Each structure stands twice: as structure tokens, then as C-alpha cells.
Amino acid sequence: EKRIRQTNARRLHNRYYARTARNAVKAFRALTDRTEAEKKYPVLASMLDRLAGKNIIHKNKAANLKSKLARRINTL
Amino acid sequence: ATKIRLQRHGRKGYAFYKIVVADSRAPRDGKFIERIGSYNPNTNATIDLNFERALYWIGVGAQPTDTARNILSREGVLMMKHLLGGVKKGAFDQAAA
Amino acid sequence: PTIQQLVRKGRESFADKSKSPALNSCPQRRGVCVRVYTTTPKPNSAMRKVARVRLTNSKEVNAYIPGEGHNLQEHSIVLVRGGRVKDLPGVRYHIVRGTLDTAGVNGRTQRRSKYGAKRP
Amino acid sequence: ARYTGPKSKIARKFGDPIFGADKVLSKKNYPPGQHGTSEYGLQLREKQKAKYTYGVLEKQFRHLFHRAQRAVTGELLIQFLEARLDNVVFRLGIAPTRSAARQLVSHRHITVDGSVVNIPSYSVKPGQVIGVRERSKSLEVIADALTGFNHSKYPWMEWDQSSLSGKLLHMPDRTDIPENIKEQLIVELYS
Amino acid sequence: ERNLRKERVGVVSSNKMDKTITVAVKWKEKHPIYGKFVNKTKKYHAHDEKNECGIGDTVRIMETRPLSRTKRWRLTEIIER
RNA sequence: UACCGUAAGAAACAGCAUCGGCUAACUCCUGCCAGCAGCGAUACGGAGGAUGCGAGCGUUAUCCGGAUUUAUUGGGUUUAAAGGGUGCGUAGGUUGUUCGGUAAGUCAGCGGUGGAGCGCUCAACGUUCAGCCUGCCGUUGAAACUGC
RNA sequence: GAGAGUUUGAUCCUGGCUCAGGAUGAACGCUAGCGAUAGGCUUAACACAUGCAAGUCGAGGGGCAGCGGCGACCGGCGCACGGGUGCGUAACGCGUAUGCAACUUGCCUUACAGAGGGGGAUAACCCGCGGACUAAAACCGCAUACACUUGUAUUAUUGCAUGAUAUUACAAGGAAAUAUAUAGCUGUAAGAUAGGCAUGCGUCCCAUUAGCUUGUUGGUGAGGUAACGGCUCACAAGGCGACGAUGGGUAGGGGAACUGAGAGGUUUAUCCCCCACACUGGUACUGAGACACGGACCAGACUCCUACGGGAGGCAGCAGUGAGGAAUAUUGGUCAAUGGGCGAGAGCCUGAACCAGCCAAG
Ligand SMILES: [K+]
Ligand SMILES: [K+]
Ligand SMILES: [K+]
Ligand SMILES: [Mg+2]
Ligand SMILES: [Mg+2]
Ligand SMILES: [Mg+2]
């Protein structure tokens, strides 16, 4: 029972932050303005890095996402 | 973790142990990385030991069990304290005692 | 054949058949005496006691009854081992005496272990 | 197991006095049975003669034979048979016959190198000491066989009566062992 | 001071596919049972950045990481046409 | 390890007409036995002796060798089984002689990798070192033969 | 490194058959004294009841109703190992030998840096499956790190194509645990250990199994992954096959072991390495790591109990019992030794393992 309760609570906790980050990248992926992208990037990168160092996702996954978004904003 | 332990390789009523370096998850008499000696508690206890390899593994960080730690305390394998260059350069000789 | 013929085709080795196929690679089987009857040899002219038995391995065979004097009857559970009789076509199995329903030969003083008789 | 049966029957079967001296060796000397040969028969007679004269059963005899083959094979099989605790005790004269020597060894009466060994098949290597137990040096039966007889006809035993011990100098050659056994027949049979 | 990868010398067998070729490597080896020497051939898939290889060419190819579903080799040289 | 008082508590099973080691008498003259020559008795059943093995002895079942009874080492096809009814020909297998190249087969070197003791009172068995790694891979050379 | 019999009235060949030998996790008949050392459901991934088999930390926290320590709860680590089974699987599954300039790696060792400041719920408790306050080494921001990630460079050096290793910079972003000297906590790097992917060669029969494939083959781009890749998603058309594709049947694979002078062969009984599995399927979740062996959810058998509103089990862990069968044992003792898990240690747990009991029993 203890294992079941811990797994359910941790599953909900991980789902919260993973879904928030996924929605953040989805919203960022429709941006067009360069200055808007520049001022929206750092908080999204911070959230992704916090997730990666928090073990919800992997460090290589966060690095890949950050590289993709930086290479996108480097080309308007 | 990597360990230094003894596998019971003998006969019923006559325990003969092999000193090996093996993962902690491996079975007792199963897989090992390197054989570093033998051990027989029936005599009055004959110990075979590879000094250089035992020093190398205790240096890279293999954790020995209690009995293997006693076996390494004998034959002077735990002289890493003296070999750590503790404000000196010579080598003492405590094996004669 | 030539070396290339052997390379292309090769050699084929057959499999030797088992002399007791109804046992299914077992030393002994258990059966029930479906029928108990008598047969005539193929230059002997005797009256050999045989039983048709349906073994537990879904097979029916004929088993000779060695010795003199059998207490068996129809619908009797018997132990069947290999071994054939030369002058009798058909039968290729024996019934172990002294096991299950089959009793040992009475009045036997020699070759006792082959007929299931205890020491007197 | 052991034979523990009638010995004169085997003596009269084989003709030779394997067990020793008896009146039946000269009176009524013929193979036993109220009713009393191929090369198989003679080979079997030779092998059984060796087995009965040395108290060895079939599996031990076969082990001795192929051990001798691994390490003339028939020549050293005979010295392997001779190098036995009971046989060495009997040849030292401390016991009358080979059965008596076997019983003495099996009981706590014989030591090898100062330690009591009671296995009456223990191979004795050269340069070893076999001696009577120090607690059994004063038995009524233990002394009449050695003292008085004093044969000492074998040039590979040292006796040393002053210590009641004995030593095997070396394995005797096939010519100096007084056994009427044709090892060629046995090695041909087992080959 | 690196490690070495596998190298295969062969003959081009197909180039109809874009940016990739097929290389045939043939050798004679002893039969295990009868000891005769028989011919064997193997086909490799190689990656070439230009369709510069025609049907039949002594070439050398080198092992690589998976570049496609079945593409683990790359062209290195052309011995002859 | 030591002390009393006693051989005292401890031997079966198979087969003896040939192959094979081991033979008199009584039964039966169907009952029976068998791995074969077969007997229905120096072969069936018992009694006496004999011969094997021996805490085992026999029966059945399974797998190897003798078997060359799949034959590369190491078999054959007139008459014992075994040449296609006869040709042409595709793939494949084989290739007269000689002069040079190459190094795929082949050969060689160098690396990597995978009996003697001791202790069981003896032995099975434990254990150590001398001893094969002769399989695979890498790297250097040789050119008589096969291939190109 | 060998033979014997057997077709004839009698020969010499050919050829099958039968004995003689060696070995069984064998069974049966007769008969049985001891010791040592091995082995013990080979039949069905058959059904049953009971008990045990994975817990530990009061040097993490709120409590003590219990005399110091601890029932219970929150929290850390472990239960993916040890142990069991051979269903499935002709496959980079396995064996052998390599590559990753396409990889990940808790616990362990070493080196370099740092541990500064705050706030929410909530379990238990209390009050009646509902209501309110609670603490952190539980949870989540802020400050700092340019040793790390990302992006843009310069100086290079050097490869096996895509490139790799270092320096010198700017920018952004990412941590902590303290407790009573010890035990520790965080980031980075190296090592060690363990996994993952891809390769050359080897890997059972059937042609009374001849064509197979339509993300199937390749290219461009994107997404996804620890990572390359039709892994997935939006032009050309291909690829693989008589050196056996495809389809069907049967097997877990090796070292061992047995057995042949050799050639070899047979078989995986004990033992060791790899793979697959946990009543049957599907999906995941938590985790450094999952086919999740004493964890879920759903769908299917089957079985058991209720009190008809509702719930439970999978015996391929160790032992009883029943059935199947020719046939294979105790509902035993101890953690004393070896090995594991947790713990600062003492220590606790361990049907692994050490032992003992039973069995013509090798
Ligand atoms: K000691
Ligand atoms: K973990
Ligand atoms: K323990
Ligand atoms: Mg014995
Ligand atoms: Mg003909
Ligand atoms: Mg013709």
C-alpha cells in the first residue's frame, strides 16, 4: 500500500512538471518575433534545465531541446 | 560495487576459498573479474596472494569483506598508508616482524 | 562419388529403429489384461500363454507370460517389459512376475529373481 | 568383501601351495568337486591364482592393472601387487600368513612412519618404515611368527629386530619374487 | 592513437540507388568437411556522396556507424574502373 | 583418543551342452527354456557339487565403438543393390606450355585473446605448478604451386 | 587402434541381423553390515492448504499511548540481486573477434570547487469514508557555480567520412544536509563496475516448400531517443533470392560431461557463462537500472469466500498433500562459516548458503 501510494503521488508530481514543460515548448514553437523569442527563451531554458537536473527528464534530452530552440531562434 | 571476497571452492567438510575480485551483484561462486589468491582455514591458515594486483584493486577502490580485509591486513597489503608518500620518500620494512 | 558431388549433395545417415516402440523409451509400462489366450508356435508345437494388454501409453500389444502357472485373468493390471519370443510371430513383450497383479511362480528354487520368488 | 571360505579347495585347484604347507597338498591333491581346457581357461586360472594368493577382488585388481598400464606392464603389476601393507607385513615375517597379516593390519596393530595405518591395501613406497604398534609389542601371537622363524630370505627388506620396525629398500625385480605367475597371460587377457 | 575499423576490398555490383552502392567481395576458402576450396561471395552496402561509380570497379570500403536501415560502409578509394 | 568382554551382532545373486569359465543323479518326455547354432534333453524342473562376481547379482530401456552399415581420412555400380534410352547445352566444377606483375588461396615470423607434487590414516576426491592452447584477430615478410 | 555367430550337401564372396564390450540424475526381481563423497519429479512452465522466503535505518521527522527504546505514519536505500523454469525463439539469440569520432552507468575510489538565504501543502494525531493545525535530509522558488549544458567565436593541433581534443572570451541557464571529531550533502572530471547498439565468420530438416517484399530499398527535411537509424512522419523507385529468399516443422545456445587411435560424434543429469519467462495478453508507472519473482491498471480462462450489496488467488522460491507415472525425499536445524541488503557502529534479516533426515546407491 505504501509503495502504491508513493508511486501514485510521484507519478502525479512528475506529470505536472513534464506537462508544463511540454506545453511551454509547444507554445514557444509557434513564436515569430525575434525579440519575443529572445525574451521568452531564458525562462524556458531554466525550466528545462531544472527538470533535467531534477531527474524528470534526461540531461541529454534537455541539451537536445535547448540546442534545437537556440538554433531555431538563431534563424528568426 | 566491486568487491574482494572469497568463493567456497572445496569439498563438504573441507572449505577452500578462492580470493577473487568480483561485482557485488554476482553469485558467490559464479562470475568474477580477476583471481588474486587462495585461502585455506583448515591448516595452521595458508594464504596465497598476488600482492601487486591486490594493491592495484584496493587502490582503484574495490571494497573488501571482513575476512578478506583481515587477509589483506596480513601479508601487509594495507601498506597504502606508508606508500601514500606521507612526508617521506623511503620504504620501511615491517615484513621481517 | 567425386569431391564436388559430395560437396553439392553430402552423405545421408538413417536412424536405427527401436526394438520396443510401444514402451516409448521406457523400461517398463503398466497395462490392463484386455484378453488372456493361448497361441501355437511357428517346429515346437506348444501352447504358449499370452495376454493382449492395453498399455497406459494408448497402445495395445501382446505380452508373453513366462513360467509355469499364471494366476492372471481378464482385466488385470500388469507390468510389461521388453523382450521377444523367437518362435512366436506377433508377441514382443514379457510380463514381469511378482509385480502388481502378477504373482511369482510357486515352488521355484532356482532362477528365483527372474520369476519373482522369495527365498524359502 | 573377503573370501573367508575354504582354502584347501583353492590350494588343490591350483596345485601350488599359495597359502602355505598342508597335508592336503600331498594327500588328495586334485581340483575339487565330485566330478574332479582352452586358453581362456588357463588365463582365467592364472588371474584367479593371483587374486586368491594376494587377497584382491576383481575391481581392485582391474584398477591395479590399468594403473600399472598407465605407469613391462605385466612386470610392474606384480611389484604393485607385492607393494601392499598386508603383503609387506607378511613378508617381514611378523605374521604367519597373508590372511593373518591382513587381520593384523586391519586391527590397530601396525604403524607406518610412526602413525597407525589400518587399511590393508595401502601401497608402500620405497624408503618407508613399517613397524608394530608400541602398545602391541608384547602379544603372545605377535612374537612366535617373527622370532624363531627369522627367514630373512628377501634382499629388499631390512628387519632391525632391535626396534621391531622394518624397511623396504626398493621394489624387487620380477625374477626375485617367488610367485609362480605368468604376467604375460594376465596382460593378454586384460588387453 | 585511435583504433582501427574494418576494411573490405571489393567490386561494385549495383549503383542504381542514389548516393549508395553495393560491393561484392569474393574469396576462395577451404570446405570444412571434404577439404576442397570453394568460392564464396558477400554483398555490402556502402555510402558514396556522388554517383561516380559504374558497374564493376575495384574499390575499398570502411566500416561506419549505421547510416540507414542497411548501410554500414563508406567508400574510400577506387583502384580501377 | 582411551577404557571392559566377547567371534561374539553381519552374504547374496547369476550360470554350468557350443560360442565360455563350471557336471553326477532323479522328474517330464506335454509342461518348458532360449542371444545364436536350437534342445523337445551333459539345454526343461528339482537335489548334490562347480564356476563368476560380491553388498551386490541379474532383467528391461537409452547412447557410443567394433561397422569401412554413408567410406574426406576410409566403400562401390558386367553377372550380388547400383550408368540416365541417346545427344545438344545453361549455371557450376576442372584447365597444354612459357615470360613477367600482383598477393586472393598457400607458407613463415611477431603480438593480443581464449607429468610432478601437497592434503584426504589409503582411495575416490580436493588443491598447486610445470605443461597445450594447435580456435579467432591484428601486424610484418616469402613467391615454388593454385587463382587474377 | 582386435572380434564371434548366422544363408550351403560342402565352398568363396556380397549383405543385413544377432550377440560380446563401455556409460546411465534410470526402473523392476531376489537379497542386504558400515564409513566417505556425489546425486535425487527425466512424466505437466499439473492442482491444493499452511508456514516461511526482503528487509533495514530513533546519527532523517512529527509522536511515546508503551521501560531506555519502540507499535504505527512521513522519509532514505534495497527488493531489476540471490533463488526458480526452458513455454517461446533458427534469431547479431548464442559462440568467437572487434567497433561506438552515434551511447548510458546508482552504490565505490581519487582530484577540484561549494554548502547562502525562504515558503506551501500533507501523513500520523484530534474531532466524526468527511472537517482543522502540523515537521523535514519529504516538496518547490530565490542567491552563487563559466569545473557543466546550450549558442556564437578566435588560436590551434590532428583524424577514419560524418570530424575529434584542447586553450583563450562573451551571453544565458542549472545545485546542497546537516546531525550527534565522526557520519555525512551538492556540482564537475578521471577511474572502476554494469548495461546498450552495430558489425566479420560459424550456427537443424523440407524444393511432395520458387519467387518474396510495398516503409519494402535509398535520398531530403522534421520529430523522437542515452544514442545512429524508416524508429516515426510528410520524392525516386528499389532491395533480397538455386552460395536457397520466402513459407512450414523442430530445438533455448555454449563450456562442460560421455565416448571414439584419429576423424569425430552424442547429450546439456550436477556445475559455470549468455538468452527468454513468472496463469494468458495489452499499456505503462516508479526508479541509476524493469520480461517488474513475494508492485499497479485493464481485458480473458479457471478456482475460492460472501450474504448477495461485495471481495480475493496463479504453488515455473523452500518445504506438506493429491493426481499423472515404471519412477525420485523433511510441512527439519542455524545464520557458527562464505556471500548479500540496510545500518556510524553494535547489530537486524537472509528456505542463498552451511548442515542434518530419507532414498541399492553412482
Ligand atoms: K586456524
Ligand atoms: K534507485
Ligand atoms: K551468515
Ligand atoms: Mg564396494
Ligand atoms: Mg543387378
Ligand atoms: Mg548405355
CSV table of N, CA and C in Angstrom, one decimal, chain C residues 3-82:
chain,number,residue,atom,x,y,z
C,3,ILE,N,34.6,-35.3,-55.4
C,3,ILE,CA,34.6,-34.4,-54.3
C,3,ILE,C,33.5,-33.3,-54.5
C,4,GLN,N,33.4,-32.8,-55.7
C,4,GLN,CA,32.3,-31.8,-55.9
C,4,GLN,C,30.9,-32.4,-55.7
C,5,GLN,N,30.7,-33.6,-56.2
C,5,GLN,CA,29.5,-34.3,-55.9
C,5,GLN,C,29.1,-34.4,-54.4
C,6,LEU,N,30.2,-34.7,-53.6
C,6,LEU,CA,30.0,-34.8,-52.2
C,6,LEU,C,29.7,-33.4,-51.6
C,7,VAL,N,30.4,-32.4,-52.1
C,7,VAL,CA,30.2,-31.0,-51.7
C,7,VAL,C,28.7,-30.6,-51.9
C,8,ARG,N,28.2,-30.9,-53.1
C,8,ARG,CA,26.9,-30.5,-53.5
C,8,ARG,C,25.8,-31.2,-52.7
C,9,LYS,N,26.0,-32.6,-52.6
C,9,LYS,CA,25.0,-33.4,-52.0
C,9,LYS,C,25.2,-33.8,-50.6
C,10,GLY,N,26.4,-34.4,-50.3
C,10,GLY,CA,26.7,-34.9,-49.0
C,10,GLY,C,26.3,-36.3,-48.8
C,11,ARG,N,26.4,-36.7,-47.5
C,11,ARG,CA,26.1,-38.1,-47.1
C,11,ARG,C,24.9,-38.1,-46.2
C,12,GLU,N,24.0,-39.0,-46.3
C,12,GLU,CA,22.8,-39.1,-45.5
C,12,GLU,C,22.9,-40.4,-44.6
C,13,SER,N,22.6,-40.2,-43.3
C,13,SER,CA,22.6,-41.3,-42.4
C,13,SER,C,21.2,-41.5,-41.8
C,14,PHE,N,20.8,-42.8,-41.9
C,14,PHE,CA,19.5,-43.1,-41.4
C,14,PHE,C,19.5,-43.3,-39.9
C,15,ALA,N,18.3,-43.6,-39.3
C,15,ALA,CA,18.1,-43.8,-37.9
C,15,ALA,C,17.7,-45.2,-37.6
C,16,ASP,N,18.4,-45.8,-36.7
C,16,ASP,CA,18.0,-47.2,-36.3
C,16,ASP,C,16.7,-47.2,-35.5
C,17,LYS,N,15.8,-48.1,-35.9
C,17,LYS,CA,14.5,-48.2,-35.2
C,17,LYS,C,14.7,-48.9,-33.9
C,18,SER,N,13.8,-48.6,-32.9
C,18,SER,CA,13.8,-49.2,-31.6
C,18,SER,C,13.0,-50.5,-31.6
C,19,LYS,N,13.6,-51.5,-31.0
C,19,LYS,CA,13.0,-52.8,-31.0
C,19,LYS,C,11.7,-52.9,-30.1
C,20,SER,N,11.5,-52.0,-29.3
C,20,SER,CA,10.3,-51.9,-28.4
C,20,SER,C,9.7,-50.6,-28.5
C,21,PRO,N,9.0,-50.3,-29.6
C,21,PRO,CA,8.4,-49.0,-29.9
C,21,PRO,C,7.2,-48.6,-29.0
C,22,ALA,N,6.5,-49.6,-28.5
C,22,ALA,CA,5.3,-49.3,-27.7
C,22,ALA,C,5.7,-48.9,-26.3
C,23,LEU,N,6.9,-49.1,-25.8
C,23,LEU,CA,7.3,-48.7,-24.5
C,23,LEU,C,7.5,-47.2,-24.4
C,24,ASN,N,7.8,-46.5,-25.6
C,24,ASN,CA,8.1,-45.1,-25.7
C,24,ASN,C,9.3,-44.7,-24.8
C,25,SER,N,10.4,-45.4,-25.1
C,25,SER,CA,11.7,-45.2,-24.4
C,25,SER,C,11.5,-45.2,-22.9
C,26,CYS,N,10.8,-46.2,-22.4
C,26,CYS,CA,10.6,-46.5,-21.0
C,26,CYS,C,11.0,-47.9,-20.7
C,27,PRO,N,11.6,-48.2,-19.5
C,27,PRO,CA,12.0,-49.6,-19.2
C,27,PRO,C,10.8,-50.5,-19.1
C,28,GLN,N,9.8,-50.1,-18.4
C,28,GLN,CA,8.5,-50.9,-18.2
C,28,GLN,C,7.3,-50.0,-18.3
C,29,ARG,N,6.2,-50.6,-18.7
C,29,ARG,CA,4.9,-49.9,-18.7
C,29,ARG,C,3.9,-50.6,-17.9
C,30,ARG,N,2.8,-50.0,-17.7
C,30,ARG,CA,1.7,-50.6,-16.9
C,30,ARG,C,0.5,-50.7,-17.9
C,31,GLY,N,-0.2,-51.8,-17.8
C,31,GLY,CA,-1.4,-52.1,-18.6
C,31,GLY,C,-2.4,-52.9,-17.9
C,32,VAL,N,-3.5,-53.1,-18.6
C,32,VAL,CA,-4.6,-54.0,-18.1
C,32,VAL,C,-4.8,-55.1,-19.1
C,33,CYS,N,-5.1,-56.3,-18.5
C,33,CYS,CA,-5.2,-57.5,-19.3
C,33,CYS,C,-6.5,-57.5,-20.1
C,34,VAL,N,-6.5,-57.0,-21.3
C,34,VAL,CA,-7.7,-57.0,-22.1
C,34,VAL,C,-8.2,-58.4,-22.4
C,35,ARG,N,-7.2,-59.3,-22.8
C,35,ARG,CA,-7.6,-60.7,-23.1
C,35,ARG,C,-6.5,-61.6,-22.7
C,36,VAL,N,-6.8,-62.8,-22.2
C,36,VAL,CA,-5.8,-63.8,-21.9
C,36,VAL,C,-6.1,-65.0,-22.7
C,37,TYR,N,-5.2,-65.5,-23.6
C,37,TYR,CA,-5.4,-66.5,-24.5
C,37,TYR,C,-4.1,-67.4,-24.7
C,38,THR,N,-4.2,-68.3,-25.6
C,38,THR,CA,-3.1,-69.2,-25.8
C,38,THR,C,-2.8,-69.3,-27.3
C,39,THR,N,-1.5,-69.4,-27.7
C,39,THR,CA,-1.1,-69.4,-29.1
C,39,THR,C,-0.2,-70.6,-29.3
C,40,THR,N,-0.1,-71.0,-30.6
C,40,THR,CA,0.8,-72.0,-31.1
C,40,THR,C,2.1,-71.5,-31.7
C,41,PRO,N,3.2,-72.1,-31.5
C,41,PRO,CA,4.5,-71.6,-32.0
C,41,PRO,C,4.5,-71.8,-33.5
C,42,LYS,N,5.3,-71.0,-34.2
C,42,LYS,CA,5.5,-71.1,-35.6
C,42,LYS,C,6.3,-72.3,-36.0
C,43,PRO,N,8.5,-75.5,-35.5
C,43,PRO,CA,8.7,-76.9,-35.2
C,43,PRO,C,8.7,-77.1,-33.7
C,44,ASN,N,7.8,-76.5,-32.9
C,44,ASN,CA,7.7,-76.6,-31.5
C,44,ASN,C,6.5,-77.3,-31.0
C,45,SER,N,5.3,-76.8,-31.4
C,45,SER,CA,4.0,-77.4,-31.1
C,45,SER,C,3.8,-77.4,-29.5
C,46,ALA,N,3.7,-76.2,-29.0
C,46,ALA,CA,3.4,-75.9,-27.6
C,46,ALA,C,2.1,-75.1,-27.5
C,47,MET,N,1.8,-74.7,-26.3
C,47,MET,CA,0.6,-73.9,-26.0
C,47,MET,C,1.0,-72.7,-25.1
C,48,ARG,N,1.5,-71.6,-25.8
C,48,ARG,CA,2.1,-70.5,-25.1
C,48,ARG,C,1.0,-69.5,-24.6
C,49,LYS,N,1.1,-69.2,-23.3
C,49,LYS,CA,0.2,-68.3,-22.7
C,49,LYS,C,0.5,-66.8,-22.9
C,50,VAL,N,-0.4,-66.1,-23.6
C,50,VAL,CA,-0.2,-64.7,-23.9
C,50,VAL,C,-1.4,-63.9,-23.4
C,51,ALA,N,-1.2,-62.6,-23.2
C,51,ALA,CA,-2.2,-61.7,-22.9
C,51,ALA,C,-2.1,-60.5,-23.8
C,52,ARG,N,-3.3,-60.1,-24.4
C,52,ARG,CA,-3.4,-58.8,-25.0
C,52,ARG,C,-3.7,-57.7,-24.0
C,53,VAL,N,-2.8,-56.7,-23.9
C,53,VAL,CA,-2.9,-55.7,-22.9
C,53,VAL,C,-2.9,-54.3,-23.5
C,54,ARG,N,-3.7,-53.4,-23.0
C,54,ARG,CA,-3.8,-52.1,-23.5
C,54,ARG,C,-3.0,-51.2,-22.5
C,55,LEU,N,-1.8,-50.8,-22.9
C,55,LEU,CA,-0.9,-50.0,-22.1
C,55,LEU,C,-1.4,-48.6,-21.8
C,56,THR,N,-0.9,-48.0,-20.8
C,56,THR,CA,-1.3,-46.6,-20.4
C,56,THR,C,-0.8,-45.6,-21.4
C,57,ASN,N,0.1,-45.9,-22.3
C,57,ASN,CA,0.6,-45.0,-23.4
C,57,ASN,C,-0.3,-45.0,-24.6
C,58,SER,N,-1.6,-45.4,-24.5
C,58,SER,CA,-2.5,-45.5,-25.6
C,58,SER,C,-2.0,-46.4,-26.7
C,59,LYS,N,-1.8,-47.7,-26.3
C,59,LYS,CA,-1.3,-48.7,-27.2
C,59,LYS,C,-1.7,-50.1,-26.7
C,60,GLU,N,-2.1,-51.0,-27.6
C,60,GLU,CA,-2.4,-52.4,-27.2
C,60,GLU,C,-1.4,-53.3,-27.9
C,61,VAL,N,-0.9,-54.2,-27.1
C,61,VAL,CA,0.2,-55.2,-27.6
C,61,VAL,C,-0.1,-56.5,-27.0
C,62,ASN,N,0.7,-57.5,-27.3
C,62,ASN,CA,0.6,-58.9,-26.8
C,62,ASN,C,1.9,-59.2,-26.0
C,63,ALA,N,1.7,-59.7,-24.8
C,63,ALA,CA,2.7,-60.0,-23.9
C,63,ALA,C,2.7,-61.4,-23.5
C,64,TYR,N,3.9,-62.1,-23.6
C,64,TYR,CA,4.0,-63.5,-23.2
C,64,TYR,C,4.1,-63.6,-21.7
C,65,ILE,N,3.6,-64.7,-21.2
C,65,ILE,CA,3.6,-65.0,-19.7
C,65,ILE,C,4.6,-66.1,-19.4
C,66,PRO,N,5.9,-65.8,-19.0
C,66,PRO,CA,6.8,-66.8,-18.7
C,66,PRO,C,6.5,-67.6,-17.4
C,67,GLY,N,7.2,-68.7,-17.3
C,67,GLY,CA,7.0,-69.6,-16.2
C,67,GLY,C,5.8,-70.6,-16.4
C,68,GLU,N,5.6,-71.4,-15.3
C,68,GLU,CA,4.6,-72.4,-15.3
C,68,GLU,C,3.6,-72.1,-14.2
C,69,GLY,N,2.4,-71.7,-14.6
C,69,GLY,CA,1.3,-71.4,-13.7
C,69,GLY,C,1.1,-70.0,-13.5
C,70,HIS,N,0.1,-69.4,-14.1
C,70,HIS,CA,-0.2,-68.0,-14.1
C,70,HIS,C,-1.6,-67.8,-13.4
C,71,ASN,N,-1.6,-66.9,-12.4
C,71,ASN,CA,-2.9,-66.5,-11.7
C,71,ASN,C,-3.6,-65.4,-12.4
C,72,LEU,N,-3.1,-64.9,-13.5
C,72,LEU,CA,-3.7,-63.7,-14.1
C,72,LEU,C,-5.1,-64.1,-14.7
C,73,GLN,N,-5.8,-63.1,-15.1
C,73,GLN,CA,-7.1,-63.2,-15.7
C,73,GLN,C,-7.4,-62.0,-16.5
C,74,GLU,N,-8.6,-61.9,-17.1
C,74,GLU,CA,-9.1,-60.7,-17.8
C,74,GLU,C,-9.2,-59.6,-16.9
C,75,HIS,N,-8.9,-58.4,-17.4
C,75,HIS,CA,-9.0,-57.1,-16.6
C,75,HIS,C,-8.1,-57.2,-15.4
C,76,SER,N,-6.8,-57.4,-15.6
C,76,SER,CA,-5.8,-57.4,-14.5
C,76,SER,C,-4.7,-56.5,-14.9
C,77,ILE,N,-4.3,-55.7,-13.9
C,77,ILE,CA,-3.2,-54.7,-14.1
C,77,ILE,C,-1.9,-55.4,-14.0
C,78,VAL,N,-1.1,-55.2,-15.1
C,78,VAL,CA,0.2,-55.9,-15.2
C,78,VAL,C,1.3,-55.0,-15.6
C,79,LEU,N,2.5,-55.4,-15.3
C,79,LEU,CA,3.7,-54.6,-15.7
C,79,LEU,C,4.4,-55.3,-16.8
C,80,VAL,N,4.6,-54.6,-17.9
C,80,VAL,CA,5.1,-55.1,-19.2
C,80,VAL,C,6.5,-54.6,-19.5
C,81,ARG,N,7.4,-55.5,-19.8
C,81,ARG,CA,8.8,-55.1,-20.2
C,81,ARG,C,9.1,-55.6,-21.6
C,82,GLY,N,10.2,-55.2,-22.1
C,82,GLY,CA,10.6,-55.7,-23.4
C,82,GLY,C,11.1,-57.1,-23.4
